[PDB]
Design a protein around this ligand. Structure first.
Ligand code: B12
Ligand SMILES: CN1c2c(nc(N)[nH]c2=O)NC[C@@H]1CNc1ccc(C(=O)N[C@@H](CCC(=O)O)C(=O)O)cc1
Ligand SMILES: [K+]
Ligand SMILES: [Zn+2]
Ligand SMILES: [Zn+2]
Length: 867
């Protein structure tokens, strides 16, 4: 049945025990194979609590981690102190944890590189797995092979796909040899990282010859999204077409804020559902490090989750212990598990939100104007490398009704891939709506899927060049969990008659559903839109042929969608004529079964707004209604050359607001195109350079900080705003009157032992873009080296960062060092576990120490202290 195009390793085929088939998630068939999933049907399995906050309780020294170089790495304890890891496992098993997690989340090349252990991930993964079996096999319990998100965000360009894929592949080998009962991807922050890690571990399954179940889990930030800005609706929509088995949450902030999120996963997911909150964020109660979630409260949460919502697996994360799991194992034993929903509503998604493929009484509209062949303006800015101009175009089609966007960079004598690699990093975070990737090259689609988050659409697969290319693209759409446009062209040519369209649509449907295991709701069948208006005879019945096929295939293929490029029906006509025929063809298509269209969104006219004599002649064209004498094409052109404004459109003045308000809205909305012209307009009108910085520019920067903190703006849009502010400062900097000085300088560094840099490098970017000089010394920096930089650079303040409670004690040591060396200058501490209370405690050592919750407080503090 297969051809050389086929590749059913990652996604799975339509036969056997593949994760997805034509009727959705394989629930009954996969349970038979995997005893973990078999038990989820029958009973709520209990997971372990934390590994790391247990390891921190122990009296651990540098020699226990094999020396000073690796002090604080959890993964080396599988080699250097295996019994300490086992001790914890055994204590959860005695509390009643039917599943435990291998101490292997940080076991990745690029994370392990920071301890000089880059070559060692497969090793440390193997050892942590073996330890876990030796505990679990005595107690008759399952082992889950934990893998974490790393230190480097792929959507924002901190690591490539290829390296991130390399790391998850080798770490999964290590687990699969060690004999894990499932792979578990956890604490995910970046929806593209999820897809990368899922495909990786599915390949490592194909290499070692053993297939285990897949459990993927995200963390939400307090604001209510993932770090990179993905909501729960989008996260789920991305996971529901991937080869996974369980979806869920871990860590985050506690059960309080996780509640509505797990309510969503529980209601809609056709997969099983996991849920593992931490004990909330730690505090310091007179020396001792305290968590506020009691075990009695965690039982009263997991009872609600398991018995009201229908959550299958329950457990804990950072700052829970054996006492938490004890009370959880009690509360859930003998509850009858609710069966998971049978089908899932078809949707796609961007980085940030999901979109239904069925729109009620309406259409999924795909803006057509990012097409090099089909838009002079796009073509020009593509070749001129005008990034701002392309985002203005893309942004513009959204404002007019675009649910998604079509992207086509192909042009004679250009490299399609070179242009794609420039563009897609920017689009991946720029766009607020999903992409449809338009290409005849399977390698162009492949590249695109390594860059674009969410769930995507591929345009198209057909049988033009045989079964190779068809199967190639169909496997690709199965793996990345993308929707597939199916065009009706076979090896003998384009399908012109209705009988030709059905035959071809029927055969492809059969390859995709039965062979490749695709759902109907994944397919959008494109029958052909040919130009009926060019002049020729044979071409007259061709829009009719297509509408009649589509109403036949709607009845014969219940689940499917249909897509058309309706702007091709009108070729060989004037702009204004084209608009009207396209608006009418679109409406008759909806009636016959069309669910989706490729259109210029803002040039769709409602049927109410079309002249009636024009409307009826449009019908006469579309359905081939031709009397002797009466030529409906001539009368249709006659009409437009007579009636002057029959389809005229001006759209203007969206930003025609007050000048100072416009400048501020430029920062908040992140719009740089036109920025410098407006800033000049303001200077000519008497506005002083330094008044514009501290007036409308600073106000929109406070507003950007106000919205982000409340969950009303996402992280990439915050980096956009600062970019607008950067350009603004560069423009007005030459013209200012009290010249001679900068705003201020901050030496910044993560502390000795602290490996994570995402939030340090956000503070760098945000402060530098606002014209603060930032000497970023990197990670693990000793205090001796910090004060060398200070003595050289004469900064206005010192900033220290680190994620953990041990980071906070190192900062206390650094203040004791700085006090005794005689330093008096301002220090600014921040960090994920660092609280406001603990810094006020530290003021007894060093008076001029301040606390930052985020980089916008650093903003505030830098302003305040520099003057
Ligand atoms: C996902 C996550 C991770 C990621 C971190 C990804 C990264 N940042 O690179 C991973 C999984 C890798 C990680 C690891 C661990 N985790 Co963790 N993790 C989290 C989490 C959810 C925070 C997520 C995060 O990245 N936020 C986003 C970043 C951008 O925010 P940020 O770091 O806070 O930075 C911001 C501000 O603090 C501020 N800022 C930071 N520094 C500075 C400096 C200055 C000068 C200024 C002005 C501002 C400033 O600006 C930033 C943006 O505005 C928290 C819980 C929570 N909700 O906070 C736990 C948390 C940090 N993790 C914790 C733990 C226990 C661990 C591990 C030890 C677990 C283990 N299995 O052993 C390991 C670390 C091991 C090691 N090698 O050292 C604890 C720490 C407490 C403790 N020690 O008891 C927390 C608080 C969870 C808890 N107990 O409730 N973690
Ligand atoms: C055949 N097409 C098509 C497809 N994708 C699918 N699935 N099906 C199709 O039928 N992709 C490309 C095209 C649909 N897209 C387009 C895009 C623009 C114009 C168009 O009419 N462009 C104008 C120029 C506009 C300008 O430059 O301002 C033209 O005159 O060609 C037509 C179709
Ligand atoms: K756990
Ligand atoms: Zn095949
Ligand atoms: Zn945690």
């Amino acid at each position: 049945a297969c051809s050389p195009g086929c590749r059913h390793h990652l996604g799975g085929a339509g036969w056997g025990d593949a994760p997805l088939v034509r009727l959705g998630y394989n629930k009954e068939a996969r349970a038979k194979k995997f005893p973990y999933l078999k038990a989820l049907l029958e009973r709520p399995l209990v997971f372990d609590g934390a590994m790391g906050t247990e390891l921190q309780k122990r009296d651990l020294t540098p020699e226990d981690y094999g020396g000073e170089a690796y002090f604080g790495c959890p993964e080396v304890l599988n080699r250097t102190r295996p019994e300490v890891v086992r001790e914890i496992h055994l204590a959860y098993l005695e509390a009643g944890a039917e599943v435990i997690e291998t101490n292997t989340a940080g076991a990745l090349r690029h994370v392990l590189a920071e301890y000089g252990l880059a070559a060692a991930a497969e090793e440390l993964a193997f050892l942590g797995a073996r330890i876990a079996r030796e505990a679990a096999d005595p107690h008759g319990a399952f082992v889950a092979g934990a893998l974490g998100p790393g230190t480097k965000l792929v959507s924002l360009g901190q690591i490539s796909w290829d390296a991130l894929y390399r790391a998850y592949k080798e770490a999964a080998r290590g687990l699969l040899k060690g004999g894990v009962d499932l792979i578990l991807l956890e604490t995910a922050q970046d929806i593209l990282q999820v897809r990368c890690a899922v495909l990786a571990v599915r390949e490592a399954m194909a290499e070692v010859g053993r297939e285990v179940p897949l459990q993927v889990q995200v963390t939400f930030e307090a604001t209510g999204t993932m770090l990179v800005g993905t909501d729960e609706q989008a996260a789920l929509a991305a996971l529901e077409s991937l080869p996974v088995d369980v979806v869920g949450m871990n860590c985050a902030t506690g059960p309080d804020l996780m509640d509505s999120k797990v309510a969503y996963f529980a209601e809609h997911s056709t997969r099983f559902v996991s849920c593992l909150p931490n004990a909330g964020l730690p505090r310091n109660e007179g020396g001792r490090v305290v968590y506020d979630l009691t075990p009695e409260e965690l039982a009263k949460w997991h009872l609600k989750f398991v018995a009201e919502y229908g959550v299958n697996a329950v457990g804990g994360c950072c700052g829970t212990g054996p006492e938490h799991i004890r009370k959880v194992a009690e509360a859930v034993k003998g509850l009858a598990p609710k069966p998971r929903p049978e089908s899932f509503p078809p949707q796609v998604a961007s980085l940030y939100q999901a979109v239904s493929l069925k729109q009620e009484a309406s259409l999924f509209l795909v803006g057509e104007r990012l097409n090099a062949t089909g838009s002079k303006r796009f073509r020009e800015m593509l070749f001129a490398r005008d990034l701002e101009g392309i985002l203005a175009l893309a942004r513009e089609q959204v404002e007019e009704g675009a649910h998604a966007l079509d992207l086509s960079v192909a042009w004679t004598g250009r490299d399609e891939l070179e242009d794609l690699r420039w563009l897609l990093p920017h689009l991946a975070t720029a766009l607020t709506v999903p992409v449809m990737v338009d290409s005849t090259s399977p390698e162009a689609m492949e590249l695109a899927l390594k860059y674009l988050p969410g769930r995507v659409l591929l345009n198209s697969a057909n049988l033009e060049d045989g079964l190779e290319r068809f199967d190639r693209v169909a496997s690709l759409a199965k793996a990345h969990g993308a929707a597939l446009v199916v065009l009706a062209i076979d090896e003998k040519g384009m399908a012109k008659t209705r009988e030709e369209k059905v035959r071809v649509a029927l055969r492809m449907y059969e390859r995709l559903t039965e062979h490749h295991g695709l759902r109907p709701e994944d397919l959008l069948f494109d029958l052909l839109t040919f130009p009926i208006t060019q002049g020729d005879e044979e071409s007259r019945p061709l829009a009719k042929e297509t509408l009649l096929a589509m109403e036949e295939l709607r009845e014969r293929l219940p689940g499917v969608g249909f897509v058309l490029g309706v702007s091709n029906v009108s070729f060989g006509l004037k702009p204004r004529a084209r608009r009207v025929l396209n608006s009418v063809f679109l409406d008759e298509a909806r009636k016959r079964g069309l669910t989706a269209a490729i259109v210029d969104a803002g040039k769709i006219l409602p049927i109410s707004q079309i002249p009636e004599e024009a409307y009826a002649l449009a019908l006469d064209l579309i359905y081939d209604r031709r009397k002797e004498g009466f030529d409906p094409l001539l009368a249709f052109m006659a009409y437009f050359e007579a009636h002057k404004e029959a389809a005229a459109k001006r759209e203007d003045a969206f930003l025609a607001l007050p000048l100072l308000e416009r400048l501020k809205r430029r920062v908040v909305e992140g719009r740089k195109q036109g920025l410098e012209a407006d800033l000049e307009e303001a200077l000519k009108a008497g506005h002083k350079p330094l008044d514009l910085i501290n007036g409308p520019l600073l106000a929109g920067m406070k507003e950007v900080g106000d919205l982000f903190g409340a969950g009303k703006m996402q992280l990439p849009f915050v980096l956009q705003a600062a970019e607008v502010m950067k350009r603004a400062v560069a423009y007005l900097e030459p013209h200012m009157e009290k010249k001679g000085e900068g705003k201020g300088t901050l030496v910044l560094a993560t502390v000795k032992g602290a490996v994570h840099d995402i939030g340090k490098n956000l503070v760098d970017i945000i402060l530098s873009h606002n014209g603060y000089r930032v000497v970023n010394l990197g990670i693990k920096v000793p205090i001796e080296e910090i004060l060398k930089a200070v003595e050289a650079h004469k900064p206005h303040a010192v900033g220290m960062s680190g994620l953990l409670v041990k980071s906070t004690l190192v900062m206390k040591e650094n203040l004791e060092y700085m006090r005794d060396a005689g330093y008096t200058l301002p220090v600014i501490l921040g960090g994920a576990a660092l609280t406001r209370s603990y810094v006020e405690e530290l003021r007894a050592i060093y008076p001029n120490v301040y606390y930052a919750e985020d980089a916008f407080e650093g903003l505030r503090l830098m302003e305040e202290l520099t003057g």
